[PDB]
Amino acid sequence: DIAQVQVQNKLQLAMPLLPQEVQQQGVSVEKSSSSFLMVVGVINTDGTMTQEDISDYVAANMKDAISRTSGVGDVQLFGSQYAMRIWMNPNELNKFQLTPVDVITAIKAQNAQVAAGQLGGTPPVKGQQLNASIIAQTRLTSTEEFGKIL
Amino acid sequence: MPNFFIDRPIFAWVIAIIIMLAGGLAILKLPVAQYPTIAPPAVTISASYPGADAKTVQDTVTQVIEQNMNGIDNLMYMSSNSDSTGTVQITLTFESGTDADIAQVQVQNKLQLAMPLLPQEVQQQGVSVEKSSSSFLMVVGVINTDGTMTQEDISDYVAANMKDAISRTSGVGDVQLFGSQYAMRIWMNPNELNKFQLTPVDVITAIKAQNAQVAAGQLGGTPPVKGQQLNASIIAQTRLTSTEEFGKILLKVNQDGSRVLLRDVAKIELGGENYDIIAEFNGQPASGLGIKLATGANALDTAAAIRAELAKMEPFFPSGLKIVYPYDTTPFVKISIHEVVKTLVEAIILVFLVMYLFLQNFRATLIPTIAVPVVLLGTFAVLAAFGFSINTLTMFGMVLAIGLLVDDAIVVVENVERVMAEEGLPPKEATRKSMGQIQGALVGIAMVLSAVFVPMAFFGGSTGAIYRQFSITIVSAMALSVLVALILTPALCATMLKPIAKGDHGEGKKGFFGWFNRMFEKSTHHYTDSVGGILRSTGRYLVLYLIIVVGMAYLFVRLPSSFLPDEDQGVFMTMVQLPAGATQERTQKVLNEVTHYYLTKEKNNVESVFAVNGFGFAGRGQNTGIAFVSLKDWADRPGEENKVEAITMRATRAFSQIKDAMVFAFNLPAIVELGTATGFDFELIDQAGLGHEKLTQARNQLLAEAAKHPDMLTSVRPNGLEDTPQFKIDIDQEKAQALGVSINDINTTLGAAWGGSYVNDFIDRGRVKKVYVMSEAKYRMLPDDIGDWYVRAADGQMVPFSAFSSSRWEYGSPRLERYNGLPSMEILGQAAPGKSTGEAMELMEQLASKLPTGVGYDWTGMSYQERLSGNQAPSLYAISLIVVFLCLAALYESWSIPFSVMLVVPLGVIGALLAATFRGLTNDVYFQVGLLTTIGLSAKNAILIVEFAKDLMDKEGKGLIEATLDAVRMRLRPILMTSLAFILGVMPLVISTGAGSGAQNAVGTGVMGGMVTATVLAIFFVPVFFVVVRRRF
Amino acid sequence: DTAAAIRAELAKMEPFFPSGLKIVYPYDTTPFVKISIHEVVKTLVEAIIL
Amino acid sequence: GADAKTVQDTVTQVIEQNMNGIDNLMYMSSNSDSTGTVQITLTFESGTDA
Amino acid sequence: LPTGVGYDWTGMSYQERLSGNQAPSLYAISLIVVFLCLAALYESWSIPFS
Amino acid sequence: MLELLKSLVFAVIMVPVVMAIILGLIYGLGEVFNIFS
Amino acid sequence: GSDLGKKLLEAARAGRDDEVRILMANGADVNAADVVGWTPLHLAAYWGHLEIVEVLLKNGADVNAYDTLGSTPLHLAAHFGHLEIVEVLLKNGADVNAKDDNGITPLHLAANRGHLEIVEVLLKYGADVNAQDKFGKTAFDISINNGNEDLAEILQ
């Protein structure tokens, strides 16, 4: 415990210096041993699911729970969680005079969660009989909503 | 051993003096608190994403953190709550005995490894990690009562002049503040911004530029030139320190040449950085300091020092500032502990009086009043060693141990005086004889009491800690008692006791004592004759015994269980919850109504009403509010109608007549780091995919199915909040681009105007404060005020929001909650009066079994504990029973005799149960400890009777009946002495009305009932058991 | 103890599995550490009897 | 790039408030320099686990 | 000195001060036990005074 | 002084009272068991 | 508003039909409005309560009401997948071609959410597909953006 504490205290002293592309992924500091205690596996007997879907179910509904059960030091998923994979095409990008930079700005702009305040906020006026939270934009949730992007 | 001290009284005096000194040093060097650390350690990650909606934070902060809450030790469970005010509270609860410090730092580091995944606004506002178990000791108030100074001025004066001192004070750990210190509020006007074709983004940029700090360098710094004689630090422009400085900020230069400032298009104020919460002390604006006690500190001395330090600073306060001290619960601690000490002293005195009434000699009564203090001081020393404190549980354990302490000394002294009166021997040989009779029985008694009181110290959870306190203190007391009785008490019985010839037992000595002697002799003869007649036919009584046992069982099953009794701590709470779309003006109207009710109707029993608008125990919004009601001293509330139960009932009945509100009043419970502790808390979870709507549907379905069993479940309610209206804005990007408008500017304008934006910091009077930018309230109140807000396009042409807004109404939740990383909805309930929580919980499990797919259930709070500590008591008490049987078989050298001692338990249990059923009590903790105490004392008495009988049947070759009769005759007196002394020392706790009445009564009722019933029935039934057992074997 | 906790948690999340998803254990050093101690205890008992 | 007083007001006096509520503490000192570097030194009683 | 200007000791001095304040008791305690323990080995209240 | 005296008097009163109550309970129960034997 | 109006709003948003009938017997303001301009019809259509919509339109419920922005019960029952409620509101005199304060029609919403049966039963009773939002986008452009092809076919 004290070892992990000192290591984290010294690493916090460096994280500012690392690239944001690393801070975003997530630095981890574990007390784990170097040998796999056990290896749980998940399969589909119906043959309809692929490795990606099984891995996503494992990572969403089985991993974060097992990474907390009083003795587990590290968990290695033998697959990968879902993600919106956006497969660009340079030909169709030049055809429209675009670049990946635009495809990234458009997403950072149109796929966002905006803080927009609320009606009747504080300090309010005398006589205000209404209060409601504003909603301006939300993180998208489907491939269709990602195709709609402009 | 005792014969080593009958010849060496000074070595015993020395041991006693050592124990006394140790106990004194401890008493002077011990903490003091209402209760020990009983609730499992919890840590709260608290965050704030200002101007956000529960979904926004739940998606951007809470899910992230919960995802990175991986790899923490001794985690028991995790909850999270996300509100529409932008706040987030993730509560991690660890196993008991976990060293909350290491867990706090673990979670803080796992979070620091997640800050780069949150948005810059949360990182700016700051994510905090606090210890949530430890509640407040007192709360200090500050009011104006003068030319009205807004609560923000009071909060600033507190944070700047009354927080460092209160934190330097001794015993003071965390010191939390209710309000927030000043901040530069910049209220912008869209009309004066459109005049000069501006936006809020320009204001933000200008402030970020003209309130920053710049590193410059040194004047002659290394590497220096040869010959340089001066080095001087450079200071460039720095942060600003007033509103005027902020006014002289250049935003623009109009074509004509004029320069635009902030003074023009933005009102600038020193105001609070958050107005969501408001405080009023008796309709007066107030601020508050929350004060927590540090580990290993005295609450009483800490509060005294705080009051002193606050009296110091009255001279240096503006005219119109007075501290008034709401929510001070240290007086209750003082009174409860002082009453317990009073009880101990009164018991010490009653022992004296009883020994004088029974023995008629001062030198013999001097002995027990020398031994009990020694044992109490030794117990204090043991507590100090093991790292304990002086609290309600410890001290009540001491009270319940007084009985055994008294029993030991009384037995020794009475047996010695009996021997000296009968055989005419002198004190030394008489004491040798008595000790030879008594020492083995005393050792066996100690080991039996250990077997009885120890196994309760292995329960799991929060009840385990209470049982641990009781068990450890009582066992220490009993062990020291047996050591003393084997060491010191004989040394004193051999020196103080003055000789008296044989044949002088009390016959004569005209007066009240010469009369009591003969009355007691008559009663002894009658009781001996009755026992002798009983022993002619015993089967008549082995049936009455089964009747008593069956009655005991019936009363046990018909006794409602509990956790702890509610007390009158001098304060209680009122809770206000308006309908969905309310404001804080309405809530403040309701709170002023409550305050008027309390200060007008209950003017005779109330001192204050600290009304907090914006914080309810379940939710944070204008819809909620609470009120701490602090009552006058109990000496000023004479009567039962002037207690907290009655005041609460009256206030609830009265507030039932308020419209558009659900106003309740409840009593501040027992240990507050816990909650109501009904053993009933439930969580529905969407374990697979489902969203909020299907989960709410399932919750309502379960509530419906639960309303159909009002015979097992009552007041089944959700603790969360119901969905409310939300103003949706479906911005369009096609038009926004056709007009050349940066969606980022749109969002920044919207937010900074309606929500707020932490821009930068500034320095006022030697303190770093923030700089917020917001809109003037007039332009945020209604949707029709949105078109009043314009953005700046790329072509320099303003654009109205009305060109792309496309707004609507919707319904969404203002408070989302999750349990172990999954969306959840909480449910609070109770067992129907007449049943246990296990039946209710099993029923709720069976109901949840009939829910849609993807919905599961889980238990929290005491319910979780009630799923661990439910399967311990029988196993541990079986261990106790077996160990006791073995100790007794060893003491008597027989596998059958011990039964004569293991059947006197119901004879006290039934008395305790009768007393509890009459007084209308419950099977709480104090009642159980009292049960064990009565059992231990009855077992002492039975053990000594049987030991005397057996020693007579072996040594003197007497018979069974003669030995039994002689034993009961020799033992009647000390039994009565002990029972009377203990009943008298306990009577106040039974007839108490005031501070601590609950625990005092729950203790004394059971203890007294058991004492009476055992004292009266054992002296008749133990001979029967002994005879029957010695015959059948 | 850790493997027991893991298996309990997995049993606590299986009922909500979709159709076909089954759990398997292709690596577990726990059964060996159980059966070895069991065999040593059997040996102790046999030794008492002899 | 900050004067001493600047640090003393923004860093030192900001951190020296919480520390008053620590266990087994004996005393504390603090220094605020002109290069912005700031140091705080807490000394606890003897017999404490560092 | 002027009023409002106090003084204190830190470092070695602190300890030194503590030492001077700890001894008077240290002598008393270390004496009492000897008076008592003696009274134990030799059962008498007089020869320990001697 | 006042508290000690008041408690001492309360005791001097209630001591023989409770003693009489207990001895009378013993008398009654012994009579009952003599009748039942 | 009045006590019974508030209690009826609560009942409708919670979904208790017996309490609704009772409050209706005591002569409750079936047109009782909330603070945001909603009515029991708005609520029973949002949350999909059908029996309550019938009970209301039988006791004199205003079907073409409108809130502080112009969203009638159709705008709500349209983009939540409510077929029976739309049929009922239509068989009782609902403006199948109304407008909000932003120029929006139930067809726009049913197209945004991709509903088809709603769009069908709306076209049946005269749902003008060629109405223009306040930006210039009719249901056809909405379907084309959403990428839904069967909807565009039904709309052409």
Residue numbers in the entry:
A (entry chain A): 101 to 250
B (entry chain B): 1 to 1033
C (entry chain A): 301 to 350
D (entry chain C): 51 to 100
E (entry chain C): 851 to 900
F (entry chain H): 1 to 37
G (entry chain D): 11 to 166
Quoted passage from the original study:
The small protein AcrZ in Escherichia coli interacts with the transmembrane portion of the multidrug efflux pump AcrB and increases resistance of the bacterium to a subset of the antibiotic substrates of that transporter. AcrB is the energy-transducing component of a tripartite multidrug efflux machinery that includes the outer membrane protein TolC and the periplasmic bridging partner AcrA. To investigate how AcrZ affects AcrB, we determined cryo-EM structures of AcrB and the AcrBZ complex reconstituted in a disc in which a bilayer of E. coli lipids is encircled by the membrane scaffold protein saposin A (Frauenfeld et al., 2016). Trimeric AcrB cycles through three states in the transport process, and DARPin associates with the subunits in the loose (L) and tight (T) states, but not with the periplasmic region of the open state (O).
To test the effects of cardiolipin on the conformation of AcrB and AcrBZ, we reconstituted the proteins into saposin discs in which the E. coli lipids were supplemented with an additional 5% cardiolipin (i.e., to ∼10% total abundance). Minor changes were seen when comparing the AcrBZ complexes in the presence and absence of excess cardiolipin. The greatest changes were seen in comparing AcrB with natural lipids with AcrBZ in the lipid environment with added cardiolipin. (A) Channel 2 entry is restricted by a loop region of PC1/2 (light red) for substrate entry from the outer leaflet of the inner membrane in case of AcrB in L state but open in the case of the AcrBZ complex in L (dark red). (B) Once substrate enters the protomer in L, a switch loop (red) allows passage into the deep-binding pocket in AcrB in complex with AcrZ. When AcrBZ saposin discs with supplementary cardiolipin were prepared with the addition of chloramphenicol, additional density was found in the cryo-EM map in the distal pocket of the AcrB protomer in the T state, which could be easily fitted with a molecule of the antibiotic. The chloramphenicol only becomes visible in the T state pocket in the case of AcrBZ with additional cardiolipin. These data suggest that the presence of AcrZ and cardiolipin can influence the occupancy of the substrate in the binding pocket. Molecular dynamics simulations also indicate that chloramphenicol is bound more stably to the binding site of the T protomer of the AcrBZ +10% cardiolipin structure compared with the AcrB structure. Our cryo-EM maps suggest that cardiolipin and AcrZ together also seem to encourage a more discrete binding mode for chloramphenicol in the AcrB distal pocket.
